[PDB]
Amino acid sequence: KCPTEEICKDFSNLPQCRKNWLGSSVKNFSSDNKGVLVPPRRQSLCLRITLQDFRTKKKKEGDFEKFIYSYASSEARKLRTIHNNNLEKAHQAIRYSFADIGNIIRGDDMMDTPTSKETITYLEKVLKIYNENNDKPKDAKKWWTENRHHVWEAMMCGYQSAQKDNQCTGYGNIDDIPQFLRWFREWGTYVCEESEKNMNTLKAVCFPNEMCSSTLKKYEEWYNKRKTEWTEQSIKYNNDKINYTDIKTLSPSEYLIEKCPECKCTKKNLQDVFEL
Ligand SMILES: [Zn+2]
Ligand SMILES: [Zn+2]
Ligand SMILES: [Zn+2]
Ligand SMILES: [Zn+2]
Protein backbone atom coordinates (compact mmCIF):
# COMPACT_ATOMS: atom_id res chain seq x y z
CA LYS A 1 0.00 0.00 0.00
CA CYS A 2 0.90 3.66 0.33
CA PRO A 3 3.00 4.64 3.37
CA THR A 4 1.23 5.82 6.55
CA GLU A 5 0.26 9.47 6.85
CA GLU A 6 2.80 9.79 9.64
CA ILE A 7 5.78 8.78 7.48
CA CYS A 8 4.69 11.23 4.78
CA LYS A 9 4.59 14.15 7.24
CA ASP A 10 8.32 13.65 7.81
CA PHE A 11 8.90 14.55 4.14
CA SER A 12 8.64 18.04 2.64
CA ASN A 13 8.28 19.54 -0.84
CA LEU A 14 10.76 21.83 -2.59
CA PRO A 15 9.53 24.64 -4.89
CA GLN A 16 12.74 24.15 -6.91
CA CYS A 17 10.99 21.32 -8.72
CA ARG A 18 8.70 22.54 -11.50
CA LYS A 19 7.37 20.83 -14.63
CA ASN A 20 14.20 15.65 -26.54
CA TRP A 21 16.50 12.59 -26.46
CA LEU A 22 20.00 14.01 -26.04
CA GLY A 23 23.14 12.43 -27.49
CA SER A 24 25.54 14.65 -25.58
CA SER A 25 26.11 15.73 -21.97
CA VAL A 26 26.80 12.05 -21.24
CA LYS A 27 30.13 11.05 -19.61
CA ASN A 28 32.46 9.44 -22.18
CA PHE A 29 29.85 9.80 -24.93
CA SER A 30 32.58 9.01 -27.49
CA SER A 31 33.94 5.90 -25.75
CA ASP A 32 32.30 3.87 -22.95
CA ASN A 33 28.89 5.44 -23.55
CA LYS A 34 28.77 5.87 -27.32
CA GLY A 35 25.15 5.52 -28.32
CA VAL A 36 23.63 6.57 -25.00
CA LEU A 37 20.70 8.97 -25.20
CA VAL A 38 19.53 10.71 -22.02
CA PRO A 39 15.79 10.55 -21.38
CA PRO A 40 14.02 13.96 -21.19
CA ARG A 41 12.71 12.91 -17.75
CA ARG A 42 16.30 12.39 -16.59
CA GLN A 43 17.48 15.72 -18.08
CA SER A 44 14.75 17.32 -16.03
CA LEU A 45 15.12 15.21 -12.86
CA CYS A 46 14.66 17.27 -9.69
CA LEU A 47 17.79 16.73 -7.59
CA ARG A 48 20.64 19.15 -7.09
CA ILE A 49 23.10 19.27 -4.22
CA THR A 50 25.59 22.09 -4.14
CA LEU A 51 28.63 22.70 -1.95
CA GLN A 52 26.44 25.23 -0.20
CA ASP A 53 23.66 22.65 0.46
CA PHE A 54 26.33 20.46 2.00
CA ARG A 55 27.47 23.33 4.25
CA THR A 56 24.02 24.08 5.62
CA LYS A 57 22.52 20.58 5.93
CA LYS A 58 25.61 18.93 7.48
CA LYS A 59 25.13 21.01 10.67
CA LYS A 60 22.21 18.89 11.91
CA GLU A 61 22.27 15.07 11.85
CA GLY A 62 19.81 13.68 9.32
CA ASP A 63 19.12 16.97 7.52
CA PHE A 64 21.21 16.15 4.45
CA GLU A 65 19.42 12.82 4.07
CA LYS A 66 16.04 14.53 4.48
CA PHE A 67 17.08 17.03 1.80
CA ILE A 68 17.54 14.11 -0.57
CA TYR A 69 14.17 12.62 0.49
CA SER A 70 12.50 15.99 -0.12
CA TYR A 71 13.87 16.19 -3.67
CA ALA A 72 12.72 12.63 -4.40
CA SER A 73 9.28 13.48 -3.06
CA SER A 74 9.07 16.60 -5.22
CA GLU A 75 10.25 14.71 -8.31
CA ALA A 76 7.44 12.22 -7.75
CA ARG A 77 4.80 14.88 -7.18
CA LYS A 78 5.94 16.64 -10.36
CA LEU A 79 5.77 13.44 -12.42
CA ARG A 80 2.23 12.69 -11.35
CA THR A 81 1.26 16.30 -12.06
CA ILE A 82 2.66 15.84 -15.59
CA HIS A 83 1.01 12.44 -16.09
CA ASN A 84 -2.19 13.31 -14.20
CA ASN A 85 -4.61 11.41 -16.47
CA ASN A 86 -2.52 8.27 -16.65
CA LEU A 87 -1.74 6.40 -13.47
CA GLU A 88 0.59 3.81 -15.01
CA LYS A 89 2.76 6.17 -17.04
CA ALA A 90 3.08 8.13 -13.80
CA HIS A 91 4.06 5.00 -11.88
CA GLN A 92 6.65 3.97 -14.42
CA ALA A 93 8.16 7.47 -14.62
CA ILE A 94 8.46 7.49 -10.79
CA ARG A 95 10.22 4.12 -10.91
CA TYR A 96 12.65 5.36 -13.57
CA SER A 97 13.45 8.49 -11.52
CA PHE A 98 13.85 6.41 -8.38
CA ALA A 99 16.45 4.28 -10.14
CA ASP A 100 18.14 7.38 -11.50
CA ILE A 101 18.34 8.88 -7.98
CA GLY A 102 20.06 5.62 -7.02
CA ASN A 103 22.83 5.95 -9.63
CA ILE A 104 23.35 9.63 -8.75
CA ILE A 105 23.72 8.87 -5.01
CA ARG A 106 25.96 5.92 -5.81
CA GLY A 107 28.13 8.04 -8.07
CA ASP A 108 27.69 6.20 -11.36
CA ASP A 109 24.96 8.16 -13.13
CA MET A 110 25.87 8.77 -16.83
CA MET A 111 24.95 12.47 -17.08
CA ASP A 112 27.91 14.81 -17.02
CA THR A 113 26.72 17.36 -14.44
CA PRO A 114 27.87 18.64 -11.05
CA THR A 115 25.00 16.90 -9.24
CA SER A 116 25.90 13.57 -10.78
CA LYS A 117 29.58 14.00 -10.03
CA GLU A 118 29.37 15.66 -6.58
CA THR A 119 26.37 14.15 -4.71
CA ILE A 120 28.28 11.03 -3.74
CA THR A 121 31.18 13.10 -2.37
CA TYR A 122 28.88 15.26 -0.20
CA LEU A 123 26.84 12.33 1.16
CA GLU A 124 29.91 10.32 2.08
CA LYS A 125 31.57 13.23 3.88
CA VAL A 126 28.39 13.75 5.96
CA LEU A 127 28.28 10.01 6.77
CA LYS A 128 31.93 10.12 7.88
CA ILE A 129 31.05 12.95 10.25
CA TYR A 130 28.07 11.25 11.90
CA ASN A 131 28.73 7.52 11.50
CA GLU A 132 32.47 7.06 11.98
CA ASN A 133 32.12 5.50 15.43
CA ASN A 134 28.87 3.57 15.05
CA ASP A 135 27.71 0.77 12.72
CA LYS A 136 25.86 3.02 10.26
CA PRO A 137 26.81 3.38 6.55
CA LYS A 138 30.00 5.24 5.66
CA ASP A 139 29.79 4.76 1.90
CA ALA A 140 27.03 5.63 -0.56
CA LYS A 141 26.55 2.08 -1.83
CA LYS A 142 25.66 0.74 1.61
CA TRP A 143 23.63 3.89 2.32
CA TRP A 144 21.49 3.25 -0.78
CA THR A 145 20.89 -0.41 0.18
CA GLU A 146 19.83 0.61 3.68
CA ASN A 147 17.82 3.69 2.73
CA ARG A 148 16.35 3.05 -0.71
CA HIS A 149 13.13 1.94 0.99
CA HIS A 150 12.88 5.36 2.66
CA VAL A 151 13.60 7.07 -0.66
CA TRP A 152 10.76 5.13 -2.24
CA GLU A 153 8.36 6.02 0.58
CA ALA A 154 9.18 9.73 0.02
CA MET A 155 8.35 9.26 -3.66
CA MET A 156 5.03 7.61 -2.86
CA CYS A 157 4.22 10.35 -0.34
CA GLY A 158 5.13 12.78 -3.10
CA TYR A 159 2.99 11.00 -5.69
CA GLN A 160 -0.02 11.02 -3.34
CA SER A 161 0.18 14.79 -2.70
CA ALA A 162 -0.34 15.52 -6.42
CA GLN A 163 -4.02 14.50 -6.41
CA LYS A 164 -4.62 12.37 -3.29
CA ASP A 165 -4.10 9.08 -5.12
CA ASN A 166 -4.60 6.02 -2.93
CA GLN A 167 -2.98 3.67 -5.44
CA CYS A 168 0.72 3.32 -4.66
CA THR A 169 3.08 0.63 -5.95
CA GLY A 170 6.43 -1.01 -5.34
CA TYR A 171 9.47 -0.34 -7.49
CA GLY A 172 10.14 -3.91 -8.54
CA ASN A 173 13.89 -4.22 -8.78
CA ILE A 174 14.14 -1.20 -11.07
CA ASP A 175 17.17 0.31 -9.30
CA ASP A 176 19.19 -2.88 -9.92
CA ILE A 177 18.75 -2.75 -13.70
CA PRO A 178 21.80 -1.20 -15.39
CA GLN A 179 21.06 2.44 -16.18
CA PHE A 180 21.71 2.27 -19.95
CA LEU A 181 19.19 -0.57 -20.17
CA ARG A 182 16.56 1.41 -18.24
CA TRP A 183 16.99 4.40 -20.54
CA PHE A 184 16.78 2.15 -23.59
CA ARG A 185 13.56 0.62 -22.14
CA GLU A 186 12.04 4.04 -21.44
CA TRP A 187 12.80 5.03 -25.03
CA GLY A 188 11.09 1.76 -25.91
CA THR A 189 7.94 2.65 -23.95
CA TYR A 190 7.56 5.94 -25.82
CA VAL A 191 8.47 4.67 -29.27
CA CYS A 192 6.56 1.38 -29.44
CA GLU A 193 3.51 3.38 -28.36
CA GLU A 194 4.09 5.94 -31.11
CA SER A 195 4.71 3.11 -33.56
CA GLU A 196 1.45 1.30 -32.83
CA LYS A 197 -0.53 4.53 -33.00
CA ASN A 198 1.17 5.76 -36.16
CA MET A 199 0.61 2.45 -37.95
CA ASN A 200 -3.11 2.38 -37.17
CA THR A 201 -3.32 5.95 -38.39
CA LEU A 202 -1.40 5.14 -41.57
CA LYS A 203 -3.42 2.01 -42.40
CA ALA A 204 -6.73 3.74 -41.60
CA VAL A 205 -6.00 6.71 -43.85
CA CYS A 206 -4.16 4.91 -46.63
CA PHE A 207 -5.86 1.51 -46.64
CA PRO A 208 -9.51 1.52 -45.44
CA ASN A 209 -5.83 10.64 -51.69
CA GLU A 210 -3.67 13.58 -50.66
CA MET A 211 -4.51 12.83 -47.03
CA CYS A 212 -2.86 9.44 -47.47
CA SER A 213 0.16 11.03 -49.09
CA SER A 214 0.28 13.66 -46.34
CA THR A 215 -0.07 11.00 -43.62
CA LEU A 216 2.71 8.89 -45.12
CA LYS A 217 5.05 11.89 -45.30
CA LYS A 218 4.59 12.53 -41.59
CA TYR A 219 4.90 8.81 -40.82
CA GLU A 220 8.25 8.91 -42.62
CA GLU A 221 9.50 11.89 -40.59
CA TRP A 222 8.55 10.16 -37.33
CA TYR A 223 10.29 7.00 -38.55
CA ASN A 224 13.55 8.70 -39.54
CA LYS A 225 13.74 10.58 -36.22
CA ARG A 226 13.33 7.44 -34.13
CA LYS A 227 15.43 5.31 -36.52
CA THR A 228 18.55 7.41 -35.80
CA GLU A 229 17.92 6.99 -32.09
CA TRP A 230 17.39 3.27 -32.52
CA THR A 231 20.68 3.07 -34.37
CA GLU A 232 22.58 5.02 -31.70
CA GLN A 233 21.17 3.08 -28.76
CA SER A 234 21.81 -0.28 -30.46
CA ILE A 235 25.52 0.60 -30.53
CA LYS A 236 25.67 0.87 -26.74
CA TYR A 237 23.38 -2.15 -26.28
CA ASN A 238 25.49 -4.39 -28.52
CA ASN A 239 28.81 -3.27 -27.05
CA ASP A 240 27.72 -3.91 -23.47
CA LYS A 241 25.43 -6.96 -23.66
CA ILE A 242 28.46 -9.30 -23.65
CA ASN A 243 28.77 -8.73 -19.91
CA TYR A 244 25.28 -10.02 -19.02
CA THR A 245 24.79 -13.75 -19.32
CA ASP A 246 21.04 -13.56 -19.90
CA ILE A 247 20.95 -10.99 -22.71
CA LYS A 248 24.32 -11.53 -24.48
CA THR A 249 22.70 -13.45 -27.36
CA LEU A 250 19.72 -11.10 -27.66
CA SER A 251 19.44 -8.38 -30.31
CA PRO A 252 18.27 -4.92 -29.23
CA SER A 253 14.78 -5.65 -30.56
CA GLU A 254 14.62 -9.02 -28.77
CA TYR A 255 15.63 -7.28 -25.57
CA LEU A 256 12.77 -4.79 -25.74
CA ILE A 257 10.31 -7.39 -26.99
CA GLU A 258 11.05 -10.15 -24.49
CA LYS A 259 12.57 -8.38 -21.49
CA CYS A 260 10.70 -5.14 -21.08
CA PRO A 261 7.30 -5.79 -19.42
CA GLU A 262 6.49 -2.08 -19.29
CA CYS A 263 7.34 -1.55 -23.02
CA LYS A 264 4.51 -2.95 -25.17
CA CYS A 265 7.01 -3.53 -27.96
CA THR A 266 6.13 -6.20 -30.51
CA LYS A 267 7.59 -7.81 -33.62
CA LYS A 268 5.13 -5.74 -35.68
CA ASN A 269 5.59 -2.34 -34.01
CA LEU A 270 9.34 -2.50 -33.30
CA GLN A 271 11.18 -5.29 -35.05
CA ASP A 272 9.39 -5.05 -38.40
CA VAL A 273 9.66 -1.26 -38.35
CA PHE A 274 13.18 -0.57 -37.17
CA GLU A 275 15.22 -3.67 -38.02
CA LEU A 276 14.63 -4.45 -41.72
ZN1 LIG B 1 1.24 0.97 -11.27
ZN1 LIG C 1 6.64 10.84 -19.22
ZN1 LIG D 1 33.02 16.16 -18.48
ZN1 LIG E 1 11.05 4.79 5.91
What's the CA-to-centroid distance between 106 and ligand 3, angstroms?
A: 18
Ligand 4 geometric centre to CA of 109 (Å): 24
Residue 244: give the domain boundaries: 1-276
* Cα 4 to averaged position of ligand 4 atoms, centre (Å): 10
153 is in an annotated binding site: yes
User: Is 112 annotated in some ligand binding site?
Assistant: yes
Nearest 5°: the CA angle 187, 223, 238 is: 50
Q: How far apart are CA 226 and CA 68, in angstroms?
A: 34
Number of structural domains (the chain) is 1
Binding site annotation covers 53?
Answer: no
Technique that determined the structure = X-ray
Is 190 annotated as ligand-binding?
yes
Please give the distance, rounded to the nearest whole angstrom, from the Cα atom of residue 144 to the centre of ligand 4: 12
Give the number of other Cβ atoms within 10 Å of residue 151's Cβ: 21
Tell me the CA–centroid distance for residue 149 and ligand 4, in Å.
6
146 is in an annotated binding site: no
Q: Which residues surround ligand 3, an ion (CB under 5 A)?
A: 112
Tell me the C-alpha distance between 13 and 71, whole Å: 7
Is the distance from CB of 102 to CB of 175 less than 8 angstroms? yes
- Is 254 annotated to bind ligand? no
